Symmetry: D3
C-alpha cells in the first residue's frame, strides 16, 4: 500500500495538484496520495520545512515525501532524493516505533530539506536526473510536477533510489541558516516563526531545551515581549485551558516542543495584527 | 473497505491533518479518509455540528465519523464514541437505504454531537480511555489527534466499540441548547445560522415544519427582515432560478430543509456584509 | 482501480463535497476520488473550463471527470455525459500515450465543457436522465450532487454511457464564445484570463501560435500594456529565473502554452491589484 | 466685510487650498474665505454641483462663490463668471434661511465663478442668471497661468478681485447661453400612485440615503406628510414607513424613517443609526416610490 | 471681534458647515468662526463632550461655543444655552493657558449653546454655570425650523445672535438644573497602591492612549513624577514605565512612555511611534494602574 | 490685518488646532489664521517641509508661518524663529504668483517659527534667511510649558506674538547657522541623456506622481517642452510620453501625461484619472528618466 505525502506551494485553486496526482496514480497504481498542505507562502523555504520536518513518525514505513516549492523551476538545477535515517513515537499506547532508513524525501535542492536532514540524519542522497523517473523534456515552469511529483511516484512504485542519478556529497545539498536563540541568564531572545493558523496562536523558535538551559520549567512566571513593545505575562503551562477564563493568555510548549503564546479559546495574533518575524524576548525570575 | 470521514477545525495550512491521516493509515491499512472540511470557525461547536449532522445517509455502512474541535485539549476530559441508531435516502433511483446502528461518531464530549444525537438517536455511548486506542502519553495541545483521529482509526479497523472505555449514561453527554424558532400567526422569528459559502446564500434556523405550522407553503408571498432593518420580499420557490433574472431575490428551502435567502446566480450576503447571528423575521399573509 | 476527478464550485468550508464523495464510494466501492479544485468563482463557466480542459493526459485511461458549477440547479435542464476523442504526453521519459476515447466528462449542459470539446473532440454525447444513475426525486438546489456526482460514480463503476439517456446532437450541447486574440503586424490584443494563484502571475489568452503568427519567438523584446495604462517590458524567456534578480519582470509561455507575465520569485498581480478581465496589448519590433 | 465661499477638489492634505487663500487675502485685504468642502470626488461635476447649488440664501448679499474641479486645467478653456438672479428659497418646505421668518435675499446679489465644464448646471437652472462672462482679463487672472493649477489661476485669483469690487462685466466678453456647458440630470418618472428615481448621494457622515425625488414630485403624486410609503432600492430592498418630518418620528433607535431632507428631496434613514454604511449602499441605486 | 467656536458632527464632506457659517456671518457681521472639529462619531455625546470641555481658557472672553450632535432634531426638544461660571485652569499641571504665567479668564465670560441631550455634561460639571435657558425665541431661532437640521436652526443661528450681543436671558425661559440632561461617567476606583479605569480615547492622529485616571487620582494614590508604574490594558497587556513629563523621556524611539496628557489624565504611548494603531487598541479597554 | 499660516501634525479630529487658534486670537486680536493642512504623517519632517516651502510668495508681506511636528516636545529643545530673505518665485516656470505679472514680494518679509528639528531645511535652503533665534523669552512662550504640547506652547503662542508685531530679535539668543538642524535630501543624478531620482510624493487627492527631478535638472539634460520621454518607476514600469504643460495634452481620458507640476518638478499622471491609486504606487519608488 504505497503512500506519497504531498506538500507544495501549488495552491488549492486550480488543476496543478490534480495534474500531479493523476501522474502519481499513472506511475504507481494503487498509490495513496496524502495531502500535507498546498498553501505555504510561495518560495518561503523555511516555512515549507516546518510542514515536513516531523512527518516521518506519523506515517507507515516506506512512505515517500514529495515536498516542493520550486522558484528555480526551468533552470539546470535538479531535485535531490534522500533516504533519511532516524524517524525520530506517535500513536496509541506507547506509539509506533519506526525502523531507521524507512522514508525518502524528494525535493528541489534549495534548502527545503534543511531541517529534515538536521533532525533525522540521512543514509544516502542522489540528484534526480534519470529520464526513467523525470521527463526527457520537462515543462520549464512546472518542475514541481516534473522533478518532484513524477519521480516521487516512481520511488513509491519501488524504483531503486540509487538509480535516479549520481550520489551527492553532503556539500552539494543546499541548506538555509536559521537564526539562533540567544540565552543570557534566564532571559532569551528569539523570533516568531509562525502564526499557528487557524487559531492565531503564536509560535517561536525558542525550544524546550533553551528554556531548560535558562532554568525555566513548568509553572515558571514569564514575561514575553513581542517586537520590543507588546508585553504578555503568564506561567508556563501544558495547554490553553490552563489560562483559566476564555480569552486569557497562556504560555505553553507547542506539539513541536517550542515556546508558544495563545489566548484560551480565542485568537491572540489576529486582533493585534501579529505576524511571523517579530522579535521575541523572554524574561523569567 | 473502511472509511473515516474527517471533520476538524485544524485548518488547511499546515501538517496537522496529515499527521492524523498518517496515523489513521498506520492503524488501519487500506482505510480511506474522506475529508468533510477542516476550516470551521475554531471552537464553534454549533457550526461544526452542522457539517456532520446529515453525513450518515451519504456514506457506506460501517463508516466512522471523526469529528473534532477540541478547545479543552489537554484537560482530564475524554472523547465520546457513539453508535447512532437511524441513519435518516440519498443516491440514484429511490436512494440507498441504510440499516440502523451502522455508523459511529467519535468526538470531544463538548456538545459537538448534540444535533447528531437529536436527529439519529443512538444505541450506545462510551468514553474513550483505553490505551489500546489512545496514547498512554497524549500531546496536551493535540487531543484532536490523540483522542479523536487515533481512536477513530482503531474503530475503523474493527476495534470493538464497547472496549474503548466505560459506557456513558445519557446525562454524561454534553449538549448545547439551540435557540427556538418563535411562531405567532404566520409570523416567525429565528436567526441566520450560516452564510452558505462560497455563494453567499443565507441559511436560517426556520424549518419547513415551522413554515407548515404557520400555513406557509410553496408560492406563498413572504417578507423577510434581517436584523430588524433589512427587508426582502419574494414567493417561496424550490430553487434559485425561480427568482427570474440573474441577481433577483429567491426564498427557498435549502437541501437541509431550512428557509434560506439568495440572489439568483449572484451573492446575497457578501455585498451587504451579512453574517450568521442576525435576527430573522418572517411575515406572510 | 476506478478514478473520478472532481472539480466543482461547492467550496471547501462545508459538507457539500463530502456528501458527493460518500455517494461516489457507495456507488463505486474502491473508487479513488481525486480533487481538482472546489474553489472556482461560482457560476463562472469559463473559469471552470480552464481547470478541466487539460486534465485527460495526466490521468489513467478510464478516468471519469465530474465537473460542475450548476446555477440552473432545480430546473428541467439535464447534465451531459461525453466520451472525448483525443486525450492530447505527460510523465517521465517521453511521457504516457493515451488511447483515443478513454475519458468521460459529465457536467451541467451549460457550456462548462466548451473548451474540453474544442481541444479533444468527442465520440458520443448523452443527456443524463435515467433514474438508474440519477435520483428519481433530485434535491432541487443540489444538482451538482444529484446530476453530476451520483451519475459520475455509476459511469466509473462501468454503467454503459449510452444508457444514461438519449444521444445528443452537437447543436444541443451549449457552448460559450471566447473573445478572439486580435493580431496586427507584431502587435496583439487580448485579455488577462486569470491571475495564477497563489503566485500572482498573470495569464493571458494570447497563445504561442498567436505569437508565431506575429513573428515573435524566444528572446524577442516585448512591451506589454495592461488595461491601456500599465506598461511592462522584457524579452520572451522560458521561465521565471530568466528575469535575473528576484522581483524582476519575466515574460514567458505558461505550462498551457499562453503568454504570461510574472515577477521572478515575487508576486506581480497582487501589489498592483491586477485581476482577470484587463485588456492586454502586446508590441514587438 | 466681503466673503468668498470656496468649494474645490483640491483636498485637505497639502498646501493647495492655502496657496489660494493667501492670494485671496493678497487681492482682497479683509476678505473672509468660508470653506465649503474640498473633499469632493475629483472631476465629478455633478457631485460638486450638489455642494454649491443651495448656498446663496445662507450668505450675505455680495458673497462670491469660487467653485472648482478643473480637469481641463491648462487648456484654452476659460472660466465662466456669472451674476445669478434669484438667491432662492430652499429646504424641506421652501423658505428663506435664518431666525424669525428668515432673511430675504435680493436678486442679482451673488456671483459664481467656475470652470466652464457643467459644474454650474444646477446653480444656473435653479437660480437663473443675468449675464455670464468668460474670464480672460489679465487684470484678474495671471498673464502666464500655471498650466496645472487653473483652480488657483482661473478661479481663486479672479474670485478675490470680484470680492474686492472689480466689475464683473470687465472680466472678459459676454457669453451666449449656448456657450455654457451643462450636464444632463436624470428626470423623475411619475405614474399616478408611483415614482421612479435614483439615489443621488449618501449623506455623510450619517449614512442617510438621498434621492432625486423632490417635494414637488411628491405633491404631483398626491403624497403629503403622514402618507404610508414603500421605497424600494435596487428593486431588491422594499422599505416601508410613513413620510415624517424627521428621524426620531420612526420611534425606536434604528427604525427606518422616510423624510424630506434639508434640500427638499425624499430621503431614507435609520433613527440615530446608519442606514447605508452597514450594507454598503451607495449612490446610483434605482429608487421606486409607492403610496400605500 | 466676536468669536464662535464651532464643534459639530456635520462632517467635512458637504456644504452643511458652510450653511451654518454663512448664517453666522449674516447675523453677526465681523464674526470669526473657529472650527473645533466636525468629524466626531455621530450621536456620541460623550465623545463630543471631550472636544469642548477644555476650550474656554484658550479663548478670549465673550467667545460663544456652538456645540452640537443633534439626533433629536425636529422634535419638540429645544436647545439649552448657558453662561458658565469658571473658565477653569487645565493641563497636566492645572494652569492658565498662554505665554508668561498665562491668561487668567474672568468668570461668567463664555456661553455654550447645545442640544439638551447631555453633550454639555462635563462642561457644566467642570466649569459650573450661572443660569441655563431653553432656546425658543423666534428672535434667535427660525419661526419654522428645518426639521432635520436643528444643528443649524437651534445652535448655529442662535449662537450668532448671542455673539452679536443678544441678551442670553431673553432666548427663552430659565431651566431648572433638573431639566438639564446629563450622561453618567465611569468613576475611577482607588485602592491604596492601585487604580482601575478605562481607555477613554485613542489620541488621533498619533495613536496615544488616554485614560480616565486623572492627576488628582494619582495624587490620592501617592503617585507622582518618576514613580515606577505598571499599566495593564484589557487585563492582558502589562506595560511598565516610570511616570514622565513627555514622550522623549522613554529614551529610544518606540519605547513605552507613561505621562499626564495635556488634559490632565494618565496616558500611554510610544516615543515618536504609534502605540494603538499597530495593535488595533481602541477606547473602552479596561485599565489597571499599579505602583511598582 | 495680520495672518498666521498654520501647518501642523495635530490632525482634524479633536480640539488641538482650536486651542492653538483661540490663543492666537487672544494674543493677536484681529489675526486671521489660514490653515495650511493638519494631516501630515506625524513626525515626518520631510513631508511637512514640502507643505511649507512654497508658501511665502502666495501671502501678503508680514505673514507668519507657524509650522510644526514636534516629537521632541517637552525636552530642553527650543523652537527656532527666523526671518527669511527671498520670498522666491516658483511654479513650473518660476514666477511671482497672482494676476497680471504677479505680485513681487519684498525680501525679509516673512517669519517662520518651528521646532528646531529640520522641518525648515528646504525653507532655509530655498529662501535663505537673515537671522535665526531660539525661542526662550517668557514674553512669548509660557513660563511653564505643557510638556506634551510644544506645538501649542512653542510655536502657536509665539507665532501670534510675532504676528502682533513683537520684535523677532527679542524672542531669545541668535543662533549660529550650525545650530540649525537640517535633514539631507536625495540628489538627482545626471547622465547626458538620462537622470535618476525618486518619487517624493503622491499628489492627493488625484493620485498624480511627483518626483524630485526639477525643471533645472531637465534643462541641464537638454530636455524641454515636447521632448519625448521615458520615465521608468521602480525599474519595472516604463511609461512613455512627451513632456507637456498639462494633463489634457495626453488626449483621451486615462492616457499618461508627463508634466512639470506647480512646484517645478517632473511628474506623471493620467488625464482625469488616477495613476497611483489603482496600482498602489507610493512615494519612495526609484525614478529613471530618459530622452527618446
Ligand atoms: N513568479 C514565480 N517566480 C518563481 N517561481 C515561481 C513563480 N510562479 C510559480 N513558481 C514556482 O513554480 C513551481 C512549479 O514548477 C512552483 O512550486 C512555484 O514555486
Ligand atoms: N488557543 C487555543 N485555545 C483553545 N484551544 C485551541 C487553541 N488552539 C488550538 N486549540 C484546539 O486544539 C485542538 C487540537 O488538539 C484543535 O481542535 C483546537 O480546537
Ligand atoms: N444563489 C445561487 N444561485 C444559483 N445557483 C447557485 C446558488 N447557490 C448555489 N448554486 C449552485 O448550486 C449548485 C449545487 O447544486 C452549485 O454548483 C452552485 O453553482
Ligand atoms: N491627473 C489629472 N487630470 C486632470 N485634471 C487634474 C489632474 N490632477 C488634478 N487635476 C485638476 O487640476 C485642478 C487644479 O488646477 C484641480 O481642480 C483638479 O481637478
Ligand atoms: N439618521 C439620523 N438619525 C438621527 N439624527 C441624525 C441622522 N442624521 C443626521 N442626524 C442629526 O441631525 C443633526 C442636524 O440637525 C446632526 O447634528 C445629526 O446629529
Ligand atoms: N507618541 C508621541 N511621541 C512623540 N511625539 C508626539 C507623540 N504624540 C504627539 N507628539 C507630538 O506632540 C506635538 C504637540 O506638542 C505634536 O506636534 C506631535 O508631533
Ligand atoms: C507554478 S506556476 C507554473 C506551473 C503551472 N503553470 C502552475 O500554475 O502550477
Ligand atoms: C491545535 S493547536 C495545537 C495542536 C497542534 N500543534 C496544531 O497546530 O494543530
Ligand atoms: C450549492 S447551494 C445548494 C446545495 C447545497 N445546499 C450546498 O450548499 O452545496
Ligand atoms: C490639482 S494640481 C494643482 C495643485 C498643486 N499642483 C498641488 O497639488 O500642489
Ligand atoms: C445632519 S442632516 C442636516 C444637514 C443637511 N441635511 C445635509 O447633510 O446636507
Ligand atoms: C500632540 S499631543 C498635544 C495635543 C493634545 N495633547 C491633544 O491631542 O489633545
Amino acid at each position: 500500500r504505497p503512500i506519497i505525502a504531498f506538500m507544495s506551494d501549488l495552491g488549492t485553486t486550480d488543476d496543478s495538484v490534480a495534474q500531479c496526482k493523476g501522474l502519481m496514480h499513472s506511475i504507481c497504481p494503487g498509490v495513496t496520495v496524502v495531502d500535507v498542505c498546498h498553501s505555504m507562502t510561495p518560495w518561503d523555504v523555511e516555512e515549507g520545512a516546518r510542514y515536513i520536518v516531523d512527518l516521518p513518525r506519523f506515517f507507515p514505513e516506506g512512505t515517500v515525501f514529495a515536498t516542493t516549492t520550486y522558484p528555480a523551476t526551468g533552470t539546470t538545477t535538479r531535485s535531490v532524493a534522500v533516504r533519511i535515517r532516524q524517524a525520530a513515537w506517535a500513536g496509541s499506547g506507547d506509539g509506533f516505533e519506526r525502523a531507521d532508513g524507512s522514508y525518502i524525501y524528494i525535493a528541489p535542492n534549495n534548502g527545503l530539506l534543511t531541517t529534515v536532514l538536521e533532525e533525522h540524519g540521512y543514509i544516502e542522497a542522489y540528484e534526480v536526473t534519470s529520464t526513467k523517473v523525470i521527463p526527457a523534456n520537462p515543462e520549464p515552469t512546472f518542475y514541481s510536477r516534473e522533478m518532484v511529483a513524477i519521480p516521487s511516484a516512481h520511488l513509491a512504485a519501488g524504483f531503486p533510489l540509487a538509480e535516479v542519478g549520481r550520489r551527492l556529497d553532503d556539500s552539494e545539498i543546499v541548506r538555509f541558516h536559521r537564526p539562533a536563540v540567544e540565552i543570557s541568564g534566564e532571559a532569551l531572545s528569539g523570533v516568531v516563526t509562525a502564526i499557528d493558523h487557524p487559531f492565531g496562536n503564536i509560535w517561536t523558535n525558542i525550544h524546550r531545551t533553551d528554556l531548560e538551559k535558562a532554568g525555566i520549567g513548568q509553572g515558571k512566571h514569564l514575561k514575553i515581549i513581542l517586537d520590543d513593545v507588546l508585553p504578555f505575562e503568564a506561567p508556563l503551562t501544558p495547554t490553553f485551558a490552563d489560562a483559566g477564563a476564555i480569552g486569557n493568555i497562556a504560555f505553553y510548549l507547542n506539539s513541536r516542543g517550542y515556546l508558544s503564546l495563545a489566548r484560551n479559546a480565542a485568537s491572540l495574533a489576529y486582533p493585534y495584527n501579529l505576524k511571523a518575524g517579530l522579535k521575541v524576548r523572554v524574561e523569567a525570575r
